[PDB]
Amino acid sequence: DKISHKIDIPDSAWTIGIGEKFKNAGHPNVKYPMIDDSYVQGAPLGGFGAGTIGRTYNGGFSRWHLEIGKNKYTTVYANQFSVFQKVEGNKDGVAQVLYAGEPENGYLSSWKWDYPKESGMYYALYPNSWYTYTNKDLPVQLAVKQFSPIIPYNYKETSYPVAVFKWTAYNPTNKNVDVSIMFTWQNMIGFFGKQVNVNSGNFNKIIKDKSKDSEIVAAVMGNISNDNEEWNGEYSIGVKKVPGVDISYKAKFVTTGDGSDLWHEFSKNGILDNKDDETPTKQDGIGSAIAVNFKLQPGQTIEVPFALSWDLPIMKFGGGDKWYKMYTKYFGKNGKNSFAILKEALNNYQKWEKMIDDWQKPILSNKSKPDWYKTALFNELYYLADGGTAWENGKVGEKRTNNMFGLLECFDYNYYETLDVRFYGSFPLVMLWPDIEKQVMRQFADTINVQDSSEFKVGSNGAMAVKKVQGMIPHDLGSSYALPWIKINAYDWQNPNIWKDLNSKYVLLVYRDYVLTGKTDKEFLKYTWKSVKTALDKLKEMDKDNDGIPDNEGIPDQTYATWSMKGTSAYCGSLWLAALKAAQEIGKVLKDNEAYIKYNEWYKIAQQNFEKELWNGEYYNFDTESDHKDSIMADQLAGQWYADILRLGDILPKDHVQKALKKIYEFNVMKFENGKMGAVNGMRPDGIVDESDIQAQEVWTGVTYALASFMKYRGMTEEAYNTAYGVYKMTYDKSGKGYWFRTPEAWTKDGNYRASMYMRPLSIWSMEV
Ligand SMILES: [Ca+2]
Numbered sequence: 001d002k003i004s005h006k007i008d009i010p011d012s013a014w015t016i017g018i019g020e021k022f023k024n025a026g027h028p029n030v031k032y033p034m035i036d037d038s039y040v041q042g043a044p045l046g047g048f049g050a051g052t053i054g055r056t057y058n059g060g061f062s063r064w065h066l067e068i069g070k071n072k073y074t075t076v077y078a079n080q081f082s083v084f085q086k087v088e089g090n091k092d093g094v095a096q097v098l099y100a101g102e103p104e105n106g107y108l109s110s111w112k113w114d115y116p117k118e119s120g121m122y123y124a125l126y127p128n129s130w131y132t133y134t135n136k137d138l139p140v141q142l143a144v145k146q147f148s149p150i151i152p153y154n155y156k157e158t159s160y161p162v163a164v165f166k167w168t169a170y171n172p173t174n175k176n177v178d179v180s181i182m183f184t185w186q187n188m189i190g191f192f193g194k195q196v197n198v199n200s201g202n203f204n205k206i207i208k209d210k211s212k213d214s215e216i217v218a219a220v221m222g223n224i225s226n227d228n229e230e231w232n233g234e235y236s237i238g239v240k241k242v243p244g245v246d247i248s249y250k251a252k253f254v255t256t257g258d259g260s261d262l263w264h265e266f267s268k269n270g271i272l273d274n275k276d277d278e279t280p281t282k283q284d285g286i287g288s289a290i291a292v293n294f295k296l297q298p299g300q301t302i303e304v305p306f307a308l309s310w311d312l313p314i315m316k317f318g319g320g321d322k323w324y325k326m327y328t329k330y331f332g333k334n335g336k337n338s339f340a341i342l343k344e345a346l347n348n349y350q351k352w353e354k355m356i357d358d359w360q361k362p363i364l365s366n367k368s369k370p371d372w373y374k375t376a377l378f379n380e381l382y383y384l385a386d387g388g389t390a391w392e393n394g395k396v397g398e399k400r401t402n403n404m405f406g407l408l409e410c411f412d413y414n415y416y417e418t419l420d421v422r423f424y425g426s427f428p429l430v431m432l433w434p435d436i437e438k439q440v441m442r443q444f445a446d447t448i449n450v451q452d453s454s455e456f457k458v459g460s461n462g463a464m465a466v467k468k469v470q471g472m473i474p475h476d477l478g479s480s481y482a483l484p485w486i487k488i489n490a491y492d493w494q495n496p497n498i499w500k501d502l503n504s505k506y507v508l509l510v511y512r513d514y515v516l517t518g519k520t521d522k523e524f525l526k527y528t529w530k531s532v533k534t535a536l537d538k539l540k541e542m543d544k545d546n547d548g549i550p551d552n553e554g555i556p557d558q559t560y561a562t563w564s565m566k567g568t569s570a571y572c573g574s575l576w577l578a579a580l581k582a583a584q585e586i587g588k589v590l591k592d593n594e595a596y597i598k599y600n601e602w603y604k605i606a607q608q609n610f611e612k613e614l615w616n617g618e619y620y621n622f623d624t625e626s627d628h629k630d631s632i633m634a635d636q637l638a639g640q641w642y643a644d645i646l647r648l649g650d651i652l653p654k655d656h657v658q659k660a661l662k663k664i665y666e667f668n669v670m671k672f673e674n675g676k677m678g679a680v681n682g683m684r685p686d687g688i689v690d691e692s693d694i695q696a697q698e699v700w701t702g703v704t705y706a707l708a709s710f711m712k713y714r715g716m717t718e719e720a721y722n723t724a725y726g727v728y729k730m731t732y733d734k735s736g737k738g739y740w741f742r743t744p745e746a747w748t749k750d751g752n753y754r755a756s757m758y759m760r761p762l763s764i765w766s767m768e769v
Pocket of ligand 1: 544
């Protein structure tokens with residue numbers, strides 16, 4: 001491994017061997033069907049709202065999120081990088097597809113598959129990933145740096161459906177070597193969204209953009225139809241000329257064939273035929289190839305950039321709505337712009353590398369923080385692009401100034417912006433893309449007073465319930481199977497209109513977004529103020545016994561739905577107290593004295609009653625009326641956690657909060673599998689896990705990271721990082737369960753999981769306040 005010195009991979013990059021087998025992998029722990037795409041994953045490519053492409057550590061383009069809201073795991077075997085190498089003096093060279101595997105069926109059988117084990121490494125520190133290729137049969141060593149321009153405070157490049165592959169080649173031997181690098185890509189128009197004739201009309205063309213000191217050669221893979229539909233658009237691959245390399249290409253090879261039409265050319269001398277052919281296909285799958293070839297002398301290094309783009313302008317949801325994706329603002333809407341996107345990338349990628357370095361450097365240069373924490377912090381951000389992200393630039397048909405945004409809870413529970421989950425999981429957005437965050441909260445503000453009196457069947461018990469009640473904040477902003485943004489509360493497993501936690505969380509999210517963007521945006525507080533007042537007022541009506549706190553009813557009425565709360569709970573109670581104190585402060589800022597005095601009076605009566613009902617000398621009781629009332633809940637003081645972030649001071653005494661957190665560490669962390677798997681939700685005071693519900697026996701990964709940040713702000717540094725380490729270990733480490741780039745909601749003590757690719761563990765960014 002001499003190639004690693006010639007590139008700059010950071011020490012905190014997650015690492016694994018190409019073709020490595022992982023034996024300890026976790027699986028779903030529920031009865032009902034659930035996504036398990038295996039441990040063969042990698043860092044995604046593509047911007048926010050663009051659709052994403054997961055290229056795995058084995059090299060394959062396998063996890064397809066190009067249909068917005070859907071997860072489709074299947075390797076498109078034609079999509080590869082391949083290498084030819086020939087030492088001078090030798091009669092024949094050697095060709096190899098850089099993929100640790102082979103096709104299932106007989107297509108592309110002529111290609112050299114099965115990249116051998118122990119001959120290269122994969123590295124990832126999102127948005128960057130790397131592959132090194134160190135093979136005894138290949139005297140020249142190769143490496144590639146791949147990424148998309150995911151850049152905080154940038155809402156432009158961050159939206160781009162593009163990826164750059166920056167190759168580096170070095171000759172450590174004492175002989176000249178001829179080398180070629182080839183990018184192949186299938187014309188994937190019709191991969192999704194086309195009901196019949198899936199390849200019909202697909203055709204490939206070659207663009208040669210000649211100019212002074214900048215030759216670009218690219219394949220544009222599109223369709224002869226100009227229909228403005230979900231399925232129609234273009235893919236493009238290409239490369240930029242550099243000193244010392246020649247470019248060659250093949251416009252059309254058959255992907256539904258043995259591939260020797262391409263491979264007989266490449267395997268001979270690493271040079272393609274330069275055959276243009278715009279003939280449309282009927283049933284055969286087609287693809288394009290772009291190759292560079294060059295001669296490396298002993299000790300010579302050379303660098304060459306390839307790129308990939310996809311112009312698929314329209315996203316369609318199952319309810320019928322068609323929207324334009326965000327990137328169309330900068331490239332157009334007609335779906336004929338893939339070359340323009342590719343060109344932009346090939347000419348500006350170095351500026352993008354530096355911009356990515358600029359935002360990662362403040363954390364990476366901090367030597368007080370361990371590498372493992374940095375690994376988790378950056379790589380958890382994968383989900384912002386991979387979470388079925390929807391970011392609209394006009395409805396098809398239809399002008400407006402705001403661009404609506406949605407991030408899925410996950411793919412098993414296909415709900416956009418689930419409010420509970422984004423309470424924990426929206427920290428990266430508020431901290432790194434605050435204009436998206438504020439847009440999402442305005443979307444919620446506009447739904448507060450929506451009344452939908454039509455009745456739906458509740459999934460858990462079969463009872464009938466009203467869809468959306470006036471003054472109650474929605475559970476979610478729709479599903480990709482139906483109508484995101486337009487039809488809210490797609491969730492039907494419980495009735496969220498009776499929930500005691502969502503209205504409080506909403507108000508806390510509003511004040512968080514004011515506080516964490518500099519306490520400057522009065523216009524935002526102005527816009528949300530009436531919804532905030534309405535949210536707290538409706539929740540006050542649920543106070544039955546008149547202690548100033550809404551009563552949990554012993555039935556599903558908060559996010560830990562099946563782990564039943566009754567009376568005053570520590571969870572909803574603390575959130576209620578924090579929400580009231582946040583609303584006081586908004587009242588002061590907007591000079592709404594009536595509201596200030598009201599929410600101040602409610603706060604004082606509730607604070608007093610919360611402490612009297614729940615404080616037990618060591619921690620705060622789960623609730624006042626359940627059979628598991630004295631359980632130690634990991635999330636018991638969630639309101640105080642947010643109160644620290646929002647700079648609202650003490651809602652509860654400092655001494656009591658410190659004892660409560662120490663107890664959670666002593667029990668929920670350290671007595672659950674030696675503190676190596678995070679904080680289990682519920683533990684009994686005797687030291688055994690609360691078995692009253694499945695949710696109590698689960699570690700929730702986002703809750704554990706949030707708890708770690710709470711510990712961190714309260715000076716409990718060892719406890720914070722030790723608590724968070726178990727989540728890192730399980731996700732990323734060789735002794736974990738193989739959840740890298742699909743961090744789940746939860747696992748049980750055996751390490752098996754519920755709901756991979758989950759939003760909540762983005763809460764790790766709460767540790768960077
Ligand atoms: Ca009450």
